[PDB]
Backbone:
């Protein structure tokens, strides 16, 4: 098994300002026991892309710091947006 | 102040005799890091005539 | 060349660009930005 820790999300391209515009992501994923529970919202984090010390800073979703007890697996999940007034969807699998 | 063609004014200190730059702890730094912005208000102005 | 007694020269930090992978020994171009115009320096 491989469990996911987080999502080094949307690497620095040559044309992106929209990653400076969001403040909150909203997760739905399947835990190991009682799968597909709803989890809450948090704020984004800024980290170096892929941990390289000479590489810009992108968004990040620290999936361990949510309202879980267990892990995540390679199954159904959704990743939604809090734009400043409305909701939006960004990632699915 | 300053005039129309000059760069703005910079404030970074908080003493009467300017040392001790303004601090921010860890939670306020992580809130500032996540794209938020602080607001600046004025309260009073004392002057001369 | 990393010598601690050698003058400071230019450097092009190729890891800190918009890549995800590596570079290889094939076709490449490396160009100046002069202060107004564009100009070319290195080709392989």
Residues:
């Amino acid at each position: 098994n491989t469990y996911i820790n987080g999502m080094y999300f949307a690497p620095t391209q040559t044309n992106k300002e929209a990653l400076d515009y969001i403040q909150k992501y909203r997760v739905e994923a399947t835990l190991q026991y009682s799968g597909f529970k709803d989890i809450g919202t948090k704020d984004k984090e800024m980290r170096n892309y892929l941990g390289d010390p000479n590489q810009p800073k992108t968004n990040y979703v620290n999936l361990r710091s949510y309202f879980t007890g267990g892990e995540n697996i390679m199954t159904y999940k959704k990743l939604r947006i809090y734009a400043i007034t409305p909701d939006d969807r960004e990632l699915l699998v | 102040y300053p005039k129309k063609g000059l760069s703005p004014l910079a404030l970074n200190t908080m003493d009467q005799f300017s040392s001790r730059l303004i601090p921010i702890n860890y939670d306020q730094l992580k809130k500032l890091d996540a794209g938020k912005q602080i607001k600046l208000e004025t309260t009073q102005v004392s002057g001369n005539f």
In short: The beta strands of chain C are 29-33, 38-43.
